[PDB]
Ligand SMILES: CCCCCCCC/C=C/CCCCCCCC(=O)O[C@@H](COC(=O)CCCCCCCCCCCCCCC)COP(=O)([O-])OCC[N+](C)(C)C
Ligand SMILES: CCCCCCCC/C=C/CCCCCCCC(=O)O[C@@H](COC(=O)CCCCCCCCCCCCCCC)COP(=O)([O-])OCC[N+](C)(C)C
Ligand SMILES: CCCCCCCC/C=C/CCCCCCCC(=O)O[C@@H](COC(=O)CCCCCCCCCCCCCCC)COP(=O)([O-])OCC[N+](C)(C)C
Ligand SMILES: CCCCCCCC/C=C/CCCCCCCC(=O)O[C@@H](COC(=O)CCCCCCCCCCCCCCC)COP(=O)([O-])OCC[N+](C)(C)C
Ligand SMILES: CCCCCCCC/C=C\CCCCCCCC(=O)O[C@@H](COC(=O)CCCCCCCCCCCCCCC)COP(=O)([O-])OCC[N+](C)(C)C
Ligand SMILES: CCCCCCCC/C=C\CCCCCCCC(=O)O[C@@H](COC(=O)CCCCCCCCCCCCCCC)COP(=O)([O-])OCC[N+](C)(C)C
Ligand SMILES: CCCCCCCC/C=C\CCCCCCCC(=O)O[C@@H](COC(=O)CCCCCCCCCCCCCCC)COP(=O)([O-])OCC[N+](C)(C)C
Ligand SMILES: [Cl-]
């Protein structure tokens with residue numbers, strides 16, 4: 001168990017820090033482009049599909065709605081208050097491909113390499129932690 | 132010959148980097164230099180160019196001849212009257228520690244066909260580009276060109292580009308919404324800052340445009356396969372096309388300016404992954420991101436989109452119109468799913484983790500609808516996504532050394548492109564050569580060659596060398612030459 | 619010297635853990651102890667400290683000199699009149715099985731610069747911290 005938590009440390013510092021920089025660059029990058037698309041209500045009207053009648057016009061709401069694609073709860077039709085439905089989906093599809101398909105599955109592969117290379121080192125860091 | 136190749140050029144174009152071919156070619160390259168000094172010493176054989184203007188060292192860098200390149204840059208010739216042909220010297224040796232000097236005659240960017248510039252600006256058809264910067268002069272030359280006068284320029288370029296994107300975010304977040312895209316300047320302090328952020332946004336879009344034009348035309352005459360070589364300069368140029376295309380759609384009374392400003396905004400933060408080079412563990416990470424897009428995501432998104440468009444065609448063919456014109460609103464999408472776009476969108480949600488699996492009821496034959504969905508989830512979600520993680524697992528193991536070398540080439544292009552920006556910095560870009568004396572020429576004159584200094588140590592070979600430049604060790608702004616020189 | 623390093627301290631700060639450097643430094647560290655016993659045996663050379671208060675064994679642990687550390691803790695000297703300089707002894711040997719004794723003079727936490735305390739409380743700029751506890755006294 002102690003070797004296991006030394007490996008947890010070496011995943012936070014080596015693989016999760018390199019992930020959460022490039023992830024938050026992609027998350028804040030595409031969510032900026034989604035808020036810039038979407039306007040206010042402008043039709044003041046729509047059937048409540050799950051009922052969030054919402055001003056998604058905040059940057060915080062869209063960064064929260066693009067984080068849900070990473071979990072597995074990404075709505076992909078989370079608002080309709082925009083124009084140009086084509087460039088809204090092209091933003092979301094380029095986000096899911098870059099982050100969910102590419103960047104998460106790459107994190108699992110890069111955690112796969114690190115386990116192979118710290119398999120002896122994490123035993124020795126643990127013996128220093130016990131010492 | 133008719134090509135212009137002399138004897139030393141022909142030894143370069145013969146060698147093909149294998150272990151047996153490197154062994155005698157660099158042995159024959161030595162013996163002809165030694166004969167070239169003994170027969171008539173007034174002629175420097177390596178200054179002779181062919182009809183492409185290449186020296187024999189620049190020819191080894193222009194092609195992928197790494198073994199000839201590793202020999203010339205590290206050439207030590209022990210024989211007196213031939214010591215001046217050496218490109219590696221030692222200036223002192225105090226017991227275990229000795230200080231090596233690598234000559235920087237045609238390399239170090241001050242010349243025209245400098246092999247540091249020739250390697251980094253190659254056209255990717257030449258082999259061993261990533262490995263030619265690992266020879267012992269060229270690695271420490273770029274690293275000490277990085278550690279001073281470049282990393283402060285590169286961190287400044289990464290500071291302005293973050294300040295460029297924060298301005299272009301805020302100018303686009305607070306865009307006007309009232310009407311047609313020529314918007315009147317209301318006399319408020321907010322709309323003054325808003326149009327200030329838009330002028331700074333377009334002026335950056337003009338800048339990355341003009342930086343891309345000078346890459347295409349002025350510097351670096353690019354081939355058609357070189358546009359699929361340099362992915363970064365395309366990505367900054369395509370960003371400036373969406374930014375300048377936004378301005379064209381802005382004044383043309385078209386609301387499609389926001390459709391192009393948004394593509395410049397999402398691609399603009401995606402191009403923040405350019406500047407993550409220069410940080411070593413982050414720069415290797417983004418080279419691996421490149422090799423996952425090109426090698427593993429391209430092979431995935433072909434077979435994925437074949438499976439996605441394949442099963443979604445079979446689902447639309449099943450489902451009809453409403454035909455019952457009735458059902459309780461489970462999440463309330465009462466919808467015509469009879470579009471092909473809606474079903475391709477509903478089968479994409481299985482890949483995310485939001486696949487409904489009962490997304491419509493407007494069909495017949497409920498059995499063959501679920502058998503389509505279950506064969507889709509098994510082929511794509513269970514098989515093809517989990518296989519992508521395994522194939523990304525293999526690629527990481529095989530590019531673990533390669534991505535470190537591609538990064539050092541990515542940093543090397545940054546170091547050379549920084550030096551091209553200033554003619555004043557080129558006189559600062561003499562990398563520590565100090566105009567050092569490395570012995571005497573034939574006719575007995577001072578040699579005075581720009582030499583990069585490398586400290587070394589050996590605990591088995593104690594270096595009682597014939598040619599050692601300084602008799603006093605170290606460097607303390609006080610020099611003393613050795614009397615062991617024939618001249 | 620001005621640093622306070624004696625001859626055995628200087629052999630520590632010379633060694634840089636490579637395979638060739640470890641080989642003769644621990645060979646030279648032996649021959650000076652053997653000469654240090656034959657010339658005048660009343661002086662214990664490893665008790666001499668520099669101006670940082672480090673012994674030659676504590677200096678090998680304070681820096682990352684694992685090959686000097688692996689030698690001193692396992693030092694067997696076969697020559698009589700120099701057997702007392704050994705840090706590894708055997709107390710009995712019955713056929714195949716023999717029982718080794720590792721001396722714990724400055725190590726085992728009772729002293730001030732105990733090398734078990736020096737290794738574990740290092741400042742992470744020193745190399746081989748995780749590997750210095752794998753030498754045969756310090757692991758067991
Ligand atoms: C918001 C959610 C965050 C979740 C994760 C945050 C968790 C806490 C993060 C805290 C801050 C990160 C620093 C870690 C601890 C500092 C000590 C150190 O030396 O660093 C590491 C160096 O390891 C590396 O050099 C490889 C990774 C590069 C650093 C990534 C920085 C990107 C942003 C990061 C921030 C991301 C978010 C910010 C986005 C803008 C420790 O590794 P080491 O084994 O001790 O030494 C290896 C020696 N080597 C360098 C020669 C190999
Ligand atoms: C540096 C640290 C980085 C970290 C964070 C970065 C800072 C973060 C934030 C920074 C500024 C935003 C906070 C202001 C809050 C009130 C504004 C407001 O809403 O009022 C008015 C707008 O007013 C504007 O137009 C906003 C100004 C836009 C300037 C764009 C370029 C900025 C740099 C210029 C040159 C630089 C040189 C000078 C530099 C000093 C009314 O708003 P509205 O238009 O009617 O409604 C929009 C609708 N929406 C809001 C729902 C979408
Ligand atoms: C006002 C608003 C603008 C904000 C300004 C911020 C941008 C402008 C700031 C520019 C200066 C940044 C320099 C910080 C590091 C110090 C230099 C150093 O030597 O450390 C080293 C460790 O560094 C790392 O390994 C961490 C990796 C960081 C990568 C991402 C940059 C984060 C900047 C903040 C977030 C970006 C913002 C994202 C978008 C907003 C780097 O060198 P090395 O090669 O790694 O190691 C040496 C090799 N060795 C291992 C063999 C020893
Ligand atoms: C829609 C979402 C797309 C998301 C991803 C798209 C991202 C951008 C895609 C851009 C287009 C794809 C080409 C990549 C760049 C061109 C340069 C090149 O040489 O190719 C690669 C060659 O690497 C390979 O040969 C292995 C992969 C085979 C290509 C897969 C094509 C399938 C469809 C693809 C389109 C999928 C979608 C279309 C479906 C109909 C570069 O690899 P290299 O390391 O430089 O050289 C290796 C040398 N080797 C060949 C000897 C090993
Ligand atoms: C895992 C993470 C995902 C989770 C989600 C968490 C994400 C958190 C995201 C955001 C923080 C949440 C707070 C803000 C949102 C609520 C209020 C709002 O609507 O916006 C307001 C502020 O305006 C802005 O939000 C800034 C405008 C553009 C952003 C520029 C940031 C620069 C990059 C910085 C570096 C980052 C780069 C990082 C890259 C590594 C605008 O509204 P208002 O009209 O001004 O208000 C009316 C009142 N008034 C008129 C009197 C003032
Ligand atoms: C929170 C507050 C926010 C609001 C305030 C912000 C207001 C104004 C904000 C941003 C202004 C917009 C600038 C647009 C120009 C393009 C931007 C860019 O990144 O390109 C270049 C900028 O490199 C340069 O330096 C070009 C000169 C810019 C003017 C100097 C600005 C210094 C201000 C700083 C003073 C502070 C420190 C002073 C020191 C004490 C760098 O890119 P590249 O690497 O050369 O090429 C790309 C890679 N490629 C080769 C693959 C294509
Ligand atoms: C990550 C990606 C997932 C995201 C989803 C994105 C997927 C995008 C998917 C589709 C694009 C979206 C636009 C079309 C749908 C909206 C309109 C409609 O209902 O269909 C209409 C068009 O008819 C068709 O759609 C074509 C019919 C069969 C498809 C043949 C394609 C051949 C393969 C090509 C190669 C592909 C192979 C690729 C394999 C690698 C039919 O309706 P209508 O009755 O004609 O309209 C009435 C008006 N009228 C009568 C006046 C005309
Ligand atoms: Cl309800």
Ligand code: NA
Nearest residue numbers: 072073484485
């Ligand atoms: Na889900």
